[PDB]
Amino acid sequence: AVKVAINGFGRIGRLAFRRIQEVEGLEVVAVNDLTDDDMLAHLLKYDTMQGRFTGEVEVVDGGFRVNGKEVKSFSEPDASKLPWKDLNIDVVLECTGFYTDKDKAQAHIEAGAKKVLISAPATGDLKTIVFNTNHQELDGSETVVSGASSTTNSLAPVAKVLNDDFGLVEGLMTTINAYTGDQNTQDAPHRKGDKRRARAAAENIIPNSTGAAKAIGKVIPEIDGKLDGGAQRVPVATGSLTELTVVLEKQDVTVEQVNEAMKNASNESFGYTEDEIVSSDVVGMTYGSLFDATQTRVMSVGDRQLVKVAAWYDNEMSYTAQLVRTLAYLAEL
Amino acid sequence: MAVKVAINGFGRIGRLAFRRIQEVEGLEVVAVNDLTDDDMLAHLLKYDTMQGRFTGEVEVVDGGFRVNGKEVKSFSEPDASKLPWKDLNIDVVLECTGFYTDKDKAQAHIEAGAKKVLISAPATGDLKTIVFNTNHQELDGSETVVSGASSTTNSLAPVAKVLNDDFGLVEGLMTTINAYTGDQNTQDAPHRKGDKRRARAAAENIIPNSTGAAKAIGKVIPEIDGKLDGGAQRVPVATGSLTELTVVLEKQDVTVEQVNEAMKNASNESFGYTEDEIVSSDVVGMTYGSLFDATQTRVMSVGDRQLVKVAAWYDNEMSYTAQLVRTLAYLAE
Amino acid sequence: AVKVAINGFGRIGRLAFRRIQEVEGLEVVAVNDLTDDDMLAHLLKYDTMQGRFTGEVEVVDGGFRVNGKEVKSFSEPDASKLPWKDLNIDVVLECTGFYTDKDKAQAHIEAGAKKVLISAPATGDLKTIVFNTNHQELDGSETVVSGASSTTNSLAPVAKVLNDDFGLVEGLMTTINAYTGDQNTQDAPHRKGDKRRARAAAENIIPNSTGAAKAIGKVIPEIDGKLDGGAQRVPVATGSLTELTVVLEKQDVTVEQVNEAMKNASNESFGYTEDEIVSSDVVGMTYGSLFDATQTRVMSVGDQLVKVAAWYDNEMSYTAQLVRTLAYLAEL
Amino acid sequence: AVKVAINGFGRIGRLAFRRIQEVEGLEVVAVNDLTDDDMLAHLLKYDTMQGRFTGEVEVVDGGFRVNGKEVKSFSEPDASKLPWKDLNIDVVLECTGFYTDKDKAQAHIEAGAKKVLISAPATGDLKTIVFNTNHQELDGSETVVSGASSTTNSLAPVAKVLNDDFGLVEGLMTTINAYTGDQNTQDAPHRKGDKRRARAAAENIIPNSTGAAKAIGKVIPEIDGKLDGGAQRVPVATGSLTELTVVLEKQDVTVEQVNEAMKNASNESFGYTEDEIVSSDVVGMTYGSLFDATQTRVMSVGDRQLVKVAAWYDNEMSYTAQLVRTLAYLAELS
Numbered sequence A: 001a002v003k004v005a006i007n008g009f010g011r012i013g014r015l016a017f018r019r020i021q022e023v024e025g026l027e028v029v030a031v032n033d034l035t036d037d038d039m040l041a042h043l044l045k046y047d048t049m050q051g052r053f054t055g056e057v058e059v060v061d062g063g064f065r066v067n068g069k070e071v072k073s074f075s076e077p078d079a080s081k082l083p084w085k086d087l088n089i090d091v092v093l094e095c096t097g098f099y100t101d102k103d104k105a106q107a108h109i110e111a112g113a114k115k116v117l118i119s120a121p122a123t124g125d126l127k128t129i130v131f132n133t134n135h136q137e138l139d140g141s142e143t144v145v146s147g148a149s150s151t152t153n154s155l156a157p158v159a160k161v162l163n164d165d166f167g168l169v170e171g172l173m174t175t176i177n178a179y180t181g182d183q184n185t186q187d188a189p190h191r192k193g194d195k196r197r198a199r200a201a202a203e204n205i206i207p208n209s210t211g212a213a214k215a216i217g218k219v220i221p222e223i224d225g226k227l228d229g230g231a232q233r234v235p236v237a238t239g240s241l242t243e244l245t246v247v248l249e250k251q252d253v254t255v256e257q258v259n260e261a262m263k264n265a266s267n268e269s270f271g272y273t274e275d276e277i278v279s280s281d282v283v284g285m286t287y288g289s290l291f292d293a294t295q296t297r298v299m300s301v302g303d304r305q306l307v308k309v310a311a312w313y314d315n316e317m318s319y320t321a322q323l324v325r326t327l328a329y330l331a332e333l
Numbered sequence B: 001m002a003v004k005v006a007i008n009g010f011g012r013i014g015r016l017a018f019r020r021i022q023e024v025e026g027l028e029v030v031a032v033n034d035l036t037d038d039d040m041l042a043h044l045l046k047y048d049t050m051q052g053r054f055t056g057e058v059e060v061v062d063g064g065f066r067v068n069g070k071e072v073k074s075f076s077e078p079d080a081s082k083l084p085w086k087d088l089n090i091d092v093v094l095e096c097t098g099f100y101t102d103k104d105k106a107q108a109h110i111e112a113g114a115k116k117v118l119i120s121a122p123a124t125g126d127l128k129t130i131v132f133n134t135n136h137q138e139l140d141g142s143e144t145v146v147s148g149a150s151s152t153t154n155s156l157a158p159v160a161k162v163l164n165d166d167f168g169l170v171e172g173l174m175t176t177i178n179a180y181t182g183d184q185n186t187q188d189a190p191h192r193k194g195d196k197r198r199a200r201a202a203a204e205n206i207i208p209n210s211t212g213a214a215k216a217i218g219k220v221i222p223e224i225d226g227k228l229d230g231g232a233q234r235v236p237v238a239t240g241s242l243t244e245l246t247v248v249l250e251k252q253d254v255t256v257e258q259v260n261e262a263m264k265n266a267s268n269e270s271f272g273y274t275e276d277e278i279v280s281s282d283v284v285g286m287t288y289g290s291l292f293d294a295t296q297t298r299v300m301s302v303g304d305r306q307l308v309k310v311a312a313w314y315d316n317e318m319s320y321t322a323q324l325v326r327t328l329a330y331l332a333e
Numbered sequence C: 001a002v003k004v005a006i007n008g009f010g011r012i013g014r015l016a017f018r019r020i021q022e023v024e025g026l027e028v029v030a031v032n033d034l035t036d037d038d039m040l041a042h043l044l045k046y047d048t049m050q051g052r053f054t055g056e057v058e059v060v061d062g063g064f065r066v067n068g069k070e071v072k073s074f075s076e077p078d079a080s081k082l083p084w085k086d087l088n089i090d091v092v093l094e095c096t097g098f099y100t101d102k103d104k105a106q107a108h109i110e111a112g113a114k115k116v117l118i119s120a121p122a123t124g125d126l127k128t129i130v131f132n133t134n135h136q137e138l139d140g141s142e143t144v145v146s147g148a149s150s151t152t153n154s155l156a157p158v159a160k161v162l163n164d165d166f167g168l169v170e171g172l173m174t175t176i177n178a179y180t181g182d183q184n185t186q187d188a189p190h191r192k193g194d195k196r197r198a199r200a201a202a203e204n205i206i207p208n209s210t211g212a213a214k215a216i217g218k219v220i221p222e223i224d225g226k227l228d229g230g231a232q233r234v235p236v237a238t239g240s241l242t243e244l245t246v247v248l249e250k251q252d253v254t255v256e257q258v259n260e261a262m263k264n265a266s267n268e269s270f271g272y273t274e275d276e277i278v279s280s281d282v283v284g285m286t287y288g289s290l291f292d293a294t295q296t297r298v299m300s301v302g303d304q305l306v307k308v309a310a311w312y313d314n315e316m317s318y319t320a321q322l323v324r325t326l327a328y329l330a331e332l
Numbered sequence D: 001a002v003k004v005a006i007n008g009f010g011r012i013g014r015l016a017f018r019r020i021q022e023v024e025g026l027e028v029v030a031v032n033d034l035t036d037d038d039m040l041a042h043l044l045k046y047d048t049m050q051g052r053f054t055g056e057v058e059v060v061d062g063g064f065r066v067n068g069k070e071v072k073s074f075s076e077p078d079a080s081k082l083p084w085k086d087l088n089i090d091v092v093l094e095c096t097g098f099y100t101d102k103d104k105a106q107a108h109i110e111a112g113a114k115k116v117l118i119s120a121p122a123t124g125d126l127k128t129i130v131f132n133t134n135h136q137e138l139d140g141s142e143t144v145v146s147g148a149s150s151t152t153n154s155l156a157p158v159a160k161v162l163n164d165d166f167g168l169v170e171g172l173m174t175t176i177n178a179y180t181g182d183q184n185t186q187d188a189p190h191r192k193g194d195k196r197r198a199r200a201a202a203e204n205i206i207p208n209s210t211g212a213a214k215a216i217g218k219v220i221p222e223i224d225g226k227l228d229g230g231a232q233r234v235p236v237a238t239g240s241l242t243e244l245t246v247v248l249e250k251q252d253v254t255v256e257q258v259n260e261a262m263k264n265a266s267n268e269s270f271g272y273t274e275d276e277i278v279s280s281d282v283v284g285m286t287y288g289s290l291f292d293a294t295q296t297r298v299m300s301v302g303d304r305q306l307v308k309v310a311a312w313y314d315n316e317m318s319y320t321a322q323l324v325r326t327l328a329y330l331a332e333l334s
């Protein structure tokens, strides 16, 4: 077993834990957060959007047991202090949100971990990886890697096909997003000064920034600088949709050419559908991106075309499945 | 000059138009028609989940109800041609049922004795389709049946007008992010119009849906006919919507702040401008047809190329209803 | 195969369909609603709260296929017209909400069905059955049966235990309910004149009446007229909680006696839990009622008022109960 | 002007600010929180459930201006450090949730404030006040007062009438509550170890404890220890309902007697309705409690009656209006 520790037993940490239970040879030996074993065990077992955990969870004092397997729990807000050397950690899933930087995340390496995979975009000389778009950039010598963002994971395969098959000139993105835990429950001061994330998460359409389209070049260099865009955060608790509006090089692009090109590029990470689904239908899915042929649009005036595509993603589980694929790749090669 | 109005369909738009007409001198609602008793109609006027309590006094009689001592006749006739409009001397019917959205169908009110019909939606037939303060001057006063267009068209037209007049519109795609409406189901259930997406629980989903606001924009601004396309995403807010517009303009050295100034200069009673980081509930109850949001403006350029992106808020209920009542008052005068 | 037809392919119809797939020897041969095969197939496949249907659904013209099994679909708003004699229907699950009366439901028997199980409380000389509380009242001769209500199904096993083990004197109930399709999406005239169910379902706490406590005597006669209560419908799309506040005959009762008594009575229909769960955590569960030991309260002044709470997925909890009763009714 | 400062510009602080604008001779001169002026001004101006603030708000550096009136803003997490002596504060509305104790709240008095009114239940030798039920307990010598809870404010006038008119034997309460800011937006570790408040606030029915019924004796002593109950927190962002199930001393009570007794006791703090309203209809209302005659139930077996009533409250504005009435009463005594 590849010995994994999860730092930050949040939405992404707990779902990565559930996902790892379904992946042979991957094992979570340790978990770190800021609370007691009873609260960690409870939130693994019960999950508002993702459902009950099928396995048996029981609290001990080391931490908790899952199907007889013991998971050590810790409460260390500073990652350098974690006993990773004593537990022989191979890879930390860094899912706190507070170590989104190569140097900060190095704390886990000091602590005795062999490698750190960060469950978000991160600053520093790091590779930023979307599984099945650029995971092959990983050579096995990396110490600290970023798993990029949920949006980037919905967007990169779509953008890669658009550029490979048609040539991407430029594009603007809107992602329509499930609200997340960095948003307040009720209108209140926001810790990062964001006057929109300050607002009641579940009662608003809230515009917000994203670096997914601006920083796409980190996963596909060829289209670096060719995209921009923002998010609208809306009151569903998970499940999201990326809409992309592009100018292509080819000007006799068609709705069929785009769909077929997406269908043909599909894999475990990039799915394809022609059903008139809605956001609830993608909750718990394991594609990093699900291309929706029903939303494809080509607009033309005189000769010039504007193309528009949409892809679904469960910002939780789609992203988590991608993260676990990358983990598994990083542990093996 | 008490212009005598009858409201057909005392629904979201009908009730709100009633409330609006109380605030507008010389407009009077003498009659109301729906499919339920006076008690139910009076109660829904008094109490409104999103728009708040009606300030006036409402009491139930049998002719119908009284509002501030003024008697309103109420009827329950599913067939408009049977309504006693000749006996009540109706000047104008606000047709707000959703079941007469066609010139010939709506003519049923004219047969019944009404002088004019204004339809609270897009409508088929040789009709004028009007966005107040964009093309209300197309009305000459001879019209028998007029369409007040859609909520989305009212949010979009003044933005698109400015973009074309000041920059030249080449082409554009739209996404409106919409509050759910009463044509959507409470729970997943057979939909009456066979729509597999409006079939789904309205308040638990991001729901792609079609709209004609962009495609049919030429009905209100002919110069840009066929230059726009796009759709909607219905999301779980009960009212308050956002129109996002991604355009190619003729001019190519355009900047964020050129665009924002051009909108601010075109602002009026129907077309608001804001630079505050607001969210959807901040527009609930507002009486602008469209509220341009300078904080959302984006210009994306690669090489030569520019894609421009703008956003305008609207309360699909009250924004639309103030527009409808302005057109009503113009049509009467 | 017991040959079932589902009248009304709604929340309860479709979920009974799903449930019947998991149940050997039960088969849905036909389905009736007010829409096309395309819509019906789609809604079976995709479900906002209950998740994707695992099987394969494909539309045909007779109706649709589910894992290669053909289901005939119909569009008859009048049940007496349905070709139940031609299809040899054993039992109809009447799930429209429009035949909730023995005589009205008889329309299916006219049509050629042998039996009708109504997915709701119903008026008439009918048995009203909560599986595992009073299903043994069914002799097999019954023509039209009621499966009672979701709330009744949540309440009956709790109330039975309280009476058998402590003696029930009187009780008030509040059920906190997921909103349902009889509520409006937006404030609008309500077809039954209910000024509260008129209101936007997902934006309000909405008081509403319920006969679960008042008509509890229909399933447990011994406590007839000893309960009353209402509902508060709130903005979750499924999952509900029944709170019961009671006077017991015994007065030295404690939290830990109450919870033990509940745990001992647990079965296929009546679950027990000591986890601090919330409504989400019961979505899709198949217990008719999940007693929550963490909510038990004993209040006393001088010489007691007792308070308990049970979860239920008003959808799946009720459906599962309905399919158990179906299966029991077929097997007599 | 009575010079007021608001410690904690949260839900209750901002709404009390907005309420104080509507009340002549009450003036907010200073505000304290943990953020900048830009965020404080913005959140006053825009309010998801209570709507846009009608007045003009503009940011300055001392703080912000509201209709030309300057409000000083601060960012001091420790209250004793606040310059209350320099600004001559008469009363602090203590609305942080972190000073709900007489001794802890004394920090404002050390700072130079004359009196502190805590927007919550509080421990210590404090009077706990529900305006129009027991505000006459205040003599004007009090240093630190509690304004009780939103539930207590919804409940006390109802319970007072039931006891005065019929004699209260015992009762159980369930309040069905709007979710609040001590709940998590998504399932996540809770700071107070509460495994239910840990869950996604807007996706769940969440049982929770409340002291409103148990601690009713603090505001009406005669019925001390006669009530108990809990809450169910549900996905509305504001607006709540108290249900009260009671045994009364009188046993021939009817729906009609109960409803009349409630109607006769109505005032600026305790409203009465016979309309089939729902929670949204009470958002922004200024009654502390709105009795709902449509929900009154009398259940009887043989001779034994159980009575059930319900009262609405905007846990936000019903509470805030009660708080400001108490504020004004406290200011207009010594």
Ligand SMILES: NC(=O)c1ccc[n+]([C@@H]2O[C@H](COP(=O)([O-])OP(=O)(O)OC[C@H]3O[C@@H](n4cnc5c(N)ncnc54)[C@H](O)[C@@H]3O)[C@@H](O)[C@H]2O)c1
Binding pocket: B008, B009, B010, B011, B012, B013, B014, B033, B034, B035, B077, B078, B079, B096, B097, B098, B099, B101, B120, B121, B150, B151, B181, B182, B316, B317, B320, C186, C187, C188, C189
């Ligand atoms: N966001 C919006 O709510 C919005 C915006 C712009 C336009 N509209 C248009 O306004 C119209 C009404 O929409 P709504 O949202 O108010 O819906 P609604 O359901 O609230 O109202 C329609 C009302 O008319 C009644 N009615 C239906 N058929 C009738 C008949 N034949 N005779 C008399 N009364 C009848 C219904 O009982 C209901 O009260 C629709 O065409 C809609 O597209 C709605």
Ligand SMILES: NC(=O)c1ccc[n+]([C@@H]2O[C@H](COP(=O)([O-])OP(=O)(O)OC[C@H]3O[C@@H](n4cnc5c(N)ncnc54)[C@H](O)[C@@H]3O)[C@@H](O)[C@H]2O)c1
Binding pocket: B187, B188, B189, B190, C007, C008, C009, C010, C011, C012, C013, C032, C033, C034, C076, C077, C078, C095, C096, C097, C098, C100, C119, C120, C149, C150, C180, C181, C314, C315, C318
């Ligand atoms: N929580 C719950 O959903 C719940 C729980 C238990 C029982 N019930 C009861 O079950 C029944 C259905 O409730 P639901 O929530 O599934 O409703 P629903 O609205 O989702 O389903 C009813 C279906 O019947 C169809 N229908 C209506 N009239 C018809 C007719 N005349 N002929 C054929 N089809 C018709 C409708 O199109 C709809 O699909 C009701 O009696 C209800 O009170 C509901």
Ligand SMILES: NC(=O)c1ccc[n+]([C@@H]2O[C@H](COP(=O)([O-])OP(=O)(O)OC[C@H]3O[C@@H](n4cnc5c(N)ncnc54)[C@H](O)[C@@H]3O)[C@@H](O)[C@H]2O)c1
Binding pocket: A186, A187, A188, A189, D007, D008, D009, D010, D011, D012, D013, D032, D033, D034, D076, D077, D078, D095, D096, D097, D098, D100, D119, D120, D149, D150, D180, D181, D315, D316, D319
């Ligand atoms: N929300 C309700 O329904 C309700 C009703 C009645 C009473 N209350 C009580 O009012 C108090 C606050 O409630 P809320 O709902 O307004 O919470 P809230 O979190 O919205 O607002 C509290 C504010 O205080 C600020 N704050 C925290 N610590 C501070 C520090 N010590 N110094 C300065 N400012 C600080 C926070 O930044 C926040 O803006 C609590 O005691 C609560 O129990 C709440």
